[PDB]
Design a protein around this ligand. Structure first.
Ligand SMILES: *C(=O)CSCCNC(=O)CCNC(=O)[C@H](O)C(C)(C)COP(=O)(O)OP(=O)(O)OC[C@H]1O[C@@H](n2cnc3c(N)ncnc32)[C@@H](O)[C@@H]1OP(=O)(O)O
Ligand SMILES: *C(=O)CSCCNC(=O)CCNC(=O)[C@H](O)C(C)(C)COP(=O)(O)OP(=O)(O)OC[C@H]1O[C@@H](n2cnc3c(N)ncnc32)[C@@H](O)[C@@H]1OP(=O)(O)O
Lengths: 334, 334
């Protein structure tokens, strides 16, 4: 009674997809909500425009749309999906899990599903869970969806970060591969950051004293910026070594679109060559939280700017002050 | 990335729990709703449950259960590579509870993320931990299921106020020489979304009182019928993919929805007389994802069963979904 010796295997991203809210919002329109200047929102962040979800574009709608596109690219039917993992931090329904409603809508009635909550690092955590699942021999096809409506958790009328977070969703399908297509994940924390990226309040408080009402992100952007340059850079190189790869091996670098500036710093401290394509979707996407790396990944692969099978470095980082990232073989363009 | 890492096997090395100090008998329950002790016990098997006080927040409960598991496993917080927290009663969008818990615990060398899958949460987390360890990328993983079901039930509503309790349970998983955790089985029934869901989302709360704070609403009979139809075959599947029959079982740890369902599961499943079946609901009530963790901690610490013995664990509920697996039990502590 020593159990069965399951037969592992290899896995990698078979297909990617995404959903981008129809309503685009330029910095000019953002300056009509807050007291800013299109010119500040760009030299500091790097955003020229972001997309904001409309009432009908719930995270479920966006997640199912992003998922379908991923399944089409991978050429996999919903019936073949064994697990659906949804990463989000902007869900106001305690239960049942969003991942179960998405699976059901998609037609994947053979699947299970949890939701996952890890702030910006969410997609890279979900992806490593998917990789481990398939490689364990227990699952063959896994769907990973990162759907966020950050606008629901941020006061647009708050120059703090009202020009920062965008909406949208990204998905990836992982399945069998003859060779390792996803490198080991690397993850870590700062526990002293809890006060750098928290919620104005908890819904529990909202009901007891309305005074501090509806929850919403508040951030000490200097501390996180320094944390990002301090720990995210080393993690990125670790993510590289653990997978047996160097900066020069990459054909792409898809970091969470927190800020083009931080992105410049990262690309800088990391020694990223000029030949390796770097995601900067933040320009017109904004900051989409855990969906950020997924949205970017989808754009990258579907551009032709990079060939299949080539190494790509991904890494999300943020709230709680925690990161997660891994290196992976890009899929063939659709 | 191309690099074949070294796989190992994993098992549960320690288990722990935190049970709120306040015990609430059916008699006290009946002073909150129009009901009787006879009715409650006859319909659920529950005689008493523990209700968390203001100071026993899910983070407090999670930390305490985690320290018991770590103590039992003889593992240092510094040795923890991942912290997975399962919970559906968290009113804080970010940062992740897991990160807050990992910090207070002392495990600053870990990352982690929150998991949300209603009653199936602990089993999904366990399969993530087993996979992480077995993949070679992590050596020790901490899984914590912590809940205050009382925070999302009315307490005055006659329909379910006598079913939930609060509490947390945890488990440490690490390397083993032989497979110590079977493959996870999981599935859903999406047409059952309307049988167990929230009275409203915080979104709808923020827009109109009354509406109340999001509270749990389910269809006894529908959930019970689905569990009997789908969970009995899932339980058998869990044994099969691990290469076991029900007779090699020393224990059965089903989610404690209530003892009447468990009674049917045991009967339909054909669990032999020699197997210990957790019936913790009798004094614990239903604690959602923490149900199985609490029952496992109690089982192991009872001294009724030996380390190494096969145990079947399965959680089931929202919405609808389940996840379960077989595993080799830890030696009881001392
Ligand atoms: C996943 O979990 C989530 S992502 C967490 C997202 N954040 C990041 O990813 C990290 C982002 N790091 C930062 O955001 C940086 O904090 C900033 C640059 C984007 C914000 O600006 P700064 O940090 O440089 O500094 P701040 O002191 O807050 O502002 C400096 C002065 O700027 C002036 N100013 C001008 N116009 C604006 C507007 N329109 N918004 C806010 N104010 C701006 C004044 O704000 C500041 O003061 P001063 O001019 O009197 O010195
Ligand atoms: C993880 O993700 C989630 S777990 C949370 C949901 N899951 C679980 O809770 C476990 C599911 N448990 C159940 O299925 C139970 O098996 C029940 C709820 C189905 C037990 O309820 P019954 O079917 O036996 O009752 P019902 O037919 O709806 O009502 C029958 C009569 O009961 C009378 N009555 C008397 N006292 C009470 C009190 N305390 N509460 C509610 N009603 C009571 C009246 O209820 C009904 O009419 P009648 O008695 O004249 O026929």
């Amino acid at each position: 009674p020593g159990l069965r010796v399951p037969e592992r295997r290899f896995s990698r991203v078979l297909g990617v997809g995404s959903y981008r809210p129809r309503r685009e919002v330029s910095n000019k329109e953002v300056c009509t909500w807050i007291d800013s200047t299109e010119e500040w929102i760009e030299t500091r962040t790097g955003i020229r425009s972001r997309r904001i979800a409309e009432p009908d574009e719930t995270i479920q709608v966006m997640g199912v749309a992003a998922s379908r596109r991923a399944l089409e690219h991978a050429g996999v039917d919903p019936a073949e999906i064994d697990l659906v993992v949804v990463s989000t931090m902007t869900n106001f329904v305690h239960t049942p899990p969003l991942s179960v409603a998405i699976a059901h809508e998609l037609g994947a009635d053979n699947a299970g599903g949890f939701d996952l909550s890890a702030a910006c690092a969410g997609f890279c955590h979900a992806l490593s869970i998917a990789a481990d699942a398939v490689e364990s021999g227990g699952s063959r096809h896994v769907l990973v969806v990162a759907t966020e409506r950050m606008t629901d958790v941020i006061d647009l009328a708050d120059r703090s970060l009202s020009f920062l977070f965008g909406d949208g969703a990204g998905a990836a399908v992982v399945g069998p591969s003859d060779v390792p297509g996803i490198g080991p994940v690397v993850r870590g924390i700062d526990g002293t950051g809890l006060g750098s990226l928290h919620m104005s309040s908890s819904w529990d408080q909202y009901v007891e004293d309305p005074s501090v009402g509806r929850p919403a992100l508040v951030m000490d952007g200097k501390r996180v910026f320094r944390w990002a340059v301090a720990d995210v850079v080393p993690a990125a190189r670790e993510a590289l070594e653990v997978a047996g790869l160097t900066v020069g091996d990459l054909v792409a670098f898809v970091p969470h679109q927190a800020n083009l500036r931080i992105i410049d710093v990262l690309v800088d401290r990391l020694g990223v060559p000029e030949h390796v394509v770097v995601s900067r979707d933040a320009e017109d996407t904004g900051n989409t939280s855990s969906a950020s790396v997924a949205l970017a990944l989808d754009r990258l692969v579907r551009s032709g700017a990079v060939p299949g099978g080539g190494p790509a470095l991904m890494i999300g980082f943020g709230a709680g002050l925690s990161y997660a990232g891994q290196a992976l073989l890009l899929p063939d363009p659709p």
